[PDB]
Scaffold this motif. Sequence first.
Motif, PDB file in Angstrom:
ATOM      1  N   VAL B  19       0.622  -1.086  -0.159  1.00  0.00           N
ATOM      2  CA  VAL B  19      -0.142  -0.026  -0.049  1.00  0.00           C
ATOM      3  C   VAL B  19       0.858   1.339  -0.042  1.00  0.00           C
ATOM      4  CG1 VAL B  19      -1.826   1.381   1.161  1.00  0.00           C
ATOM      5  CG2 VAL B  19      -1.943  -1.147   1.293  1.00  0.00           C
ATOM      6  N   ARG B  20       0.762   2.201  -1.065  1.00  0.00           N
ATOM      7  CA  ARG B  20       1.243   3.468  -1.017  1.00  0.00           C
ATOM      8  C   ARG B  20       0.212   4.414  -1.392  1.00  0.00           C
ATOM      9  NH1 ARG B  20       4.684   4.892  -6.433  1.00  0.00           N
ATOM     10  NH2 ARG B  20       3.046   4.924  -8.025  1.00  0.00           N
ATOM     11  N   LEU B  21       0.336   5.666  -0.458  1.00  0.00           N
ATOM     12  CA  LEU B  21      -0.740   6.715  -0.528  1.00  0.00           C
ATOM     13  C   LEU B  21      -0.081   7.751  -1.454  1.00  0.00           C
ATOM     14  CD1 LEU B  21      -1.851   6.590   3.241  1.00  0.00           C
ATOM     15  CD2 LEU B  21      -2.943   5.585   1.061  1.00  0.00           C
ATOM     16  N   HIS B  22      -0.779   8.258  -2.242  1.00  0.00           N
ATOM     17  CA  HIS B  22      -0.736   9.183  -2.941  1.00  0.00           C
ATOM     18  C   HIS B  22      -0.937  10.504  -2.475  1.00  0.00           C
ATOM     19  CE1 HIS B  22      -1.733  12.098  -6.711  1.00  0.00           C
ATOM     20  NE2 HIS B  22      -0.419  12.247  -6.781  1.00  0.00           N
ATOM     21  N   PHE B  23      -0.292  11.701  -2.694  1.00  0.00           N
ATOM     22  CA  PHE B  23      -0.807  13.159  -2.444  1.00  0.00           C
ATOM     23  C   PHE B  23      -0.178  14.190  -3.045  1.00  0.00           C
ATOM     24  CE2 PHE B  23       2.709  14.706  -0.015  1.00  0.00           C
ATOM     25  CZ  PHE B  23       3.461  13.832   0.028  1.00  0.00           C
ATOM     26  N   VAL B  24      -0.899  15.212  -3.385  1.00  0.00           N
ATOM     27  CA  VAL B  24      -0.621  16.522  -4.024  1.00  0.00           C
ATOM     28  C   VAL B  24      -0.199  17.420  -2.851  1.00  0.00           C
ATOM     29  CG1 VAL B  24      -1.247  18.715  -5.138  1.00  0.00           C
ATOM     30  CG2 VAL B  24      -1.773  16.306  -6.328  1.00  0.00           C
ATOM     31  N   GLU B  25       0.930  18.100  -3.104  1.00  0.00           N
ATOM     32  CA  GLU B  25       1.459  19.026  -1.911  1.00  0.00           C
ATOM     33  C   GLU B  25       1.805  20.616  -2.308  1.00  0.00           C
ATOM     34  OE1 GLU B  25       5.727  18.089  -0.271  1.00  0.00           O
ATOM     35  OE2 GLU B  25       4.564  18.425   1.592  1.00  0.00           O
ATOM     36  N   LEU B  26       1.256  21.480  -1.692  1.00  0.00           N
ATOM     37  CA  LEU B  26       1.438  22.903  -2.086  1.00  0.00           C
ATOM     38  C   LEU B  26       1.783  23.763  -0.844  1.00  0.00           C
ATOM     39  CD1 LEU B  26       1.439  24.939  -4.646  1.00  0.00           C
ATOM     40  CD2 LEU B  26      -0.860  25.409  -4.126  1.00  0.00           C
ATOM     41  N   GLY B  27       2.751  24.537  -0.990  1.00  0.00           N
ATOM     42  CA  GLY B  27       2.843  25.723   0.240  1.00  0.00           C
ATOM     43  C   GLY B  27       3.776  25.444   1.135  1.00  0.00           C
ATOM     44  N   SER B  28       3.973  26.306   2.049  1.00  0.00           N
ATOM     45  CA  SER B  28       4.795  26.106   3.419  1.00  0.00           C
ATOM     46  C   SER B  28       4.043  26.657   4.555  1.00  0.00           C
ATOM     47  CB  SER B  28       6.207  26.986   2.666  1.00  0.00           C
ATOM     48  OG  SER B  28       5.826  28.373   2.656  1.00  0.00           O
ATOM     49  N   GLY B  29       4.673  26.216   5.691  1.00  0.00           N
ATOM     50  CA  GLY B  29       4.225  26.435   7.054  1.00  0.00           C
ATOM     51  C   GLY B  29       3.326  25.237   7.599  1.00  0.00           C
ATOM     52  N   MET B  62      -4.827  14.555  -0.080  1.00  0.00           N
ATOM     53  CA  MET B  62      -4.633  12.886  -0.263  1.00  0.00           C
ATOM     54  C   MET B  62      -5.530  12.425  -1.567  1.00  0.00           C
ATOM     55  SD  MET B  62      -2.629  12.276   2.382  1.00  0.00           S
ATOM     56  CE  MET B  62      -2.784  10.523   2.087  1.00  0.00           C
ATOM     57  N   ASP B  63      -5.207  11.339  -2.141  1.00  0.00           N
ATOM     58  CA  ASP B  63      -5.754  10.225  -2.547  1.00  0.00           C
ATOM     59  C   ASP B  63      -5.896   9.215  -1.635  1.00  0.00           C
ATOM     60  OD1 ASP B  63      -6.841  11.005  -5.429  1.00  0.00           O
ATOM     61  OD2 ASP B  63      -4.670  10.198  -6.124  1.00  0.00           O
ATOM     62  N   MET B  64      -7.023   9.266  -0.820  1.00  0.00           N
ATOM     63  CA  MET B  64      -7.516   8.071   0.147  1.00  0.00           C
ATOM     64  C   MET B  64      -7.410   6.770  -0.535  1.00  0.00           C
ATOM     65  SD  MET B  64      -7.922  10.453   2.519  1.00  0.00           S
ATOM     66  CE  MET B  64      -8.778   9.650   4.086  1.00  0.00           C
ATOM     67  N   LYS B  65      -7.026   5.831   0.432  1.00  0.00           N
ATOM     68  CA  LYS B  65      -6.755   4.456  -0.202  1.00  0.00           C
ATOM     69  C   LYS B  65      -7.958   3.924  -0.777  1.00  0.00           C
ATOM     70  CE  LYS B  65      -5.629  -0.071   2.314  1.00  0.00           C
ATOM     71  NZ  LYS B  65      -5.476  -0.906   3.446  1.00  0.00           N
ATOM     72  N   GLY B  66      -7.629   3.381  -1.887  1.00  0.00           N
ATOM     73  CA  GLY B  66      -8.970   2.899  -2.753  1.00  0.00           C
ATOM     74  C   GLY B  66      -8.949   3.782  -4.113  1.00  0.00           C
ATOM     75  N   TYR B  67      -8.412   4.995  -4.013  1.00  0.00           N
ATOM     76  CA  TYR B  67      -8.621   6.031  -4.937  1.00  0.00           C
ATOM     77  C   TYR B  67      -7.405   6.491  -5.860  1.00  0.00           C
ATOM     78  CZ  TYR B  67     -13.052   6.943  -2.651  1.00  0.00           C
ATOM     79  OH  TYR B  67     -14.281   7.145  -2.180  1.00  0.00           O
ATOM     80  N   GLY B  68      -7.706   6.882  -7.159  1.00  0.00           N
ATOM     81  CA  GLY B  68      -6.509   7.610  -7.771  1.00  0.00           C
ATOM     82  C   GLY B  68      -5.228   6.918  -7.956  1.00  0.00           C
ATOM     83  N   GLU B  69      -4.168   7.506  -7.459  1.00  0.00           N
ATOM     84  CA  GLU B  69      -2.989   6.930  -7.736  1.00  0.00           C
ATOM     85  C   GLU B  69      -2.536   6.240  -6.236  1.00  0.00           C
ATOM     86  OE1 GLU B  69      -1.620  10.802 -10.082  1.00  0.00           O
ATOM     87  OE2 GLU B  69       0.070   9.249  -9.640  1.00  0.00           O
ATOM     88  N   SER B  70      -3.110   6.047  -5.341  1.00  0.00           N
ATOM     89  CA  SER B  70      -3.110   5.523  -4.025  1.00  0.00           C
ATOM     90  C   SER B  70      -3.382   4.083  -4.581  1.00  0.00           C
ATOM     91  CB  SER B  70      -4.018   5.905  -3.030  1.00  0.00           C
ATOM     92  OG  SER B  70      -3.478   7.283  -2.592  1.00  0.00           O
ATOM     93  N   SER B  71      -2.857   2.932  -3.657  1.00  0.00           N
ATOM     94  CA  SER B  71      -3.279   1.633  -3.620  1.00  0.00           C
ATOM     95  C   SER B  71      -4.598   1.371  -3.514  1.00  0.00           C
ATOM     96  CB  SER B  71      -2.339   0.768  -2.806  1.00  0.00           C
ATOM     97  OG  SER B  71      -0.991   0.877  -3.005  1.00  0.00           O
TER      98      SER B  71
END
Lengths: 316, 316
Positions: B19-29, B62-71
């Motif tokens: 299982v790997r979780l995919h996410f998109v990441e933007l910004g700082s703080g 997140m792409d939660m588990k089950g979705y998109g580019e996540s396992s």
Amino acid sequence: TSCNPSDMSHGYVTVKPRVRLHFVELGSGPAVCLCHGFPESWYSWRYQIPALAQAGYRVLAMDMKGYGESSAPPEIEEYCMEVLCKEMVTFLDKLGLSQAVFIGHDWGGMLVWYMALFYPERVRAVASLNTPFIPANPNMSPLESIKANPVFDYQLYFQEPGVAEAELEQNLSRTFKSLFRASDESVLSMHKVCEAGGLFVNSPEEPSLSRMVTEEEIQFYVQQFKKSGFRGPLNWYRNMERNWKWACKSLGRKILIPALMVTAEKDFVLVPQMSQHMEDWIPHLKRGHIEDCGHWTQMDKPTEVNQILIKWLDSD
Amino acid sequence: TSCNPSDMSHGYVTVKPRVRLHFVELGSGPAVCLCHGFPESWYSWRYQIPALAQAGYRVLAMDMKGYGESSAPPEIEEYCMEVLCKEMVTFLDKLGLSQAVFIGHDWGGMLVWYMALFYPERVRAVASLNTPFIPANPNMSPLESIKANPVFDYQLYFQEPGVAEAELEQNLSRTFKSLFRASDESVLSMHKVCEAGGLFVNSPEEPSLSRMVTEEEIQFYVQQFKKSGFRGPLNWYRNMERNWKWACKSLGRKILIPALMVTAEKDFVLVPQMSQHMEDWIPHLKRGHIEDCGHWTQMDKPTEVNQILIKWLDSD
Ligand SMILES: O=C(N[C@H]1C[C@@H]1c1ccccc1)N1CCC(Oc2ccccc2)CC1
Ligand SMILES: O=C(N[C@H]1C[C@@H]1c1ccccc1)N1CCC(Oc2ccccc2)CC1
């Protein structure tokens, strides 16, 4: 103290249609972007990544263009400093970072110096391991600097596309065991390479493992360079004229952001004294110096490296 | 102002062998983890991601588990709240984040509540869109609950593996156009789905394009669900007994961290009143309310969602 590849967050950013940069990410806090040299990997920062994360920083350890999981296009011009610098600025834009601290080693050090020079608004502060910043000389071109200093004979050897690639790719395990050594364990002579017909013409066929590295760590590099080989990485050497022309455009301007220059006593290509007059164009420059330390700074003296970087980040 | 996928930094974290979780990441703080619902995507946060980043936060969508580019493993047990929460904890660990603000919607909202309940040490603050926090009732079954609520008939229709999957996957484009609509554009009833024998038995064959979305946005969802389809997303519904039992070992604990409940006037499944007694268990609870807003809160009233989340993030 070290990173396991499969336990890291792996990030990918497309900087233009052809090209995506891979990085590994660990920590929260201010963004610190680590930029390796030749012929290395994000993994060359494996001892810094957890220490900087633990010290309160968000670490982005790059596979520089040409390496690892980052794109490796074949054209020489894709690896001039101007292009490489623009891509890194785009990298920050896509990540939504207005700024980052840049820390570089070797070719990565040259990169971060130019980032500081031309994109100071995007560089919070800058540090270099081994590589000095020398303002470009408009009078002597790049070719007259090698005649003045024979040590860079191997660089001439690296110029003709295909030649150095075949030697370096021929046996990857031997390549990395031959290169990644403490300075007293050296088995190479970057001095009469072109005449000898190769970097490993008469170094051992089966080099022993350096006390700096394990078999497992060598195999990681071996695995990484099977993906795109040595063409991209060697192209970093094949734009000296283009880099000179570009460096010459920013003659008057000086680096005014916080800056760190770290020298390694036993690095026989990037010698400490090459950095000595950097005060003349960076009076606020802070210094470190590591004794008994060869070219492979991060691997050779990780603890000293960690202490120096963490102290400098936490102050200026 | 939205997100273009090819312009985002894409992150990947293996949380266990399969299982790997995919996410998109933007910004700082400060880190803010955004958790979508069924059947959505990190992309459902497209209007919040840049606004939160611009407001001074590091957004992980997140792409939660089950979705998109996540396992999307096949087994139903992989999608019970206990496994899902534990994985989110491993996610933070490998990213080297001691804490994150969690913001959820729909099933994602149920997730962040549990994260706050069972992993308060990892959750800086918690916010849910539409999904209320109801302490588990020790005395009433999960199947027993639906027999006092006929709108939840569709949930029974979701129980048999393969059945709904086939319906929702048979024409993905129709599926999303039928679901993602303002509450006044509705073409579906969740009254009697089981015996009517399908979610789309009486809805149009070529539904019009909702005002909330463009054809291109719809096609992005289509593309995403072609990888894994609906089995993984639907498995989120097929763990009610296990989730109940798990929740029934948390009845003493209260949420002490900062908390935000956002209700949507026209969400006809997650009705506002369902949340009406939440301050009995969370006295410090902050609230937001959005008029004329159906279930798809993020796309329906993105301005209002942004205003509310940013204000609460800047305060507690
Ligand atoms: O070749 C290296 N690195 C050697 C260790 C790599 C090596 C060498 C040989 C084999 C394998 C690996 N350089 C020289 C070019 C540039 O330095 C400059 C350039 C211009 C000005 C100042 C410094 C970056 C560092
Ligand atoms: O089915 C949904 N979401 C509907 C909008 C999705 C939908 C519906 C129909 C088609 C497509 C999509 N859930 C069920 C689980 C939980 O509800 C509970 C359960 C227990 C307690 C509190 C709340 C969250 C809402």
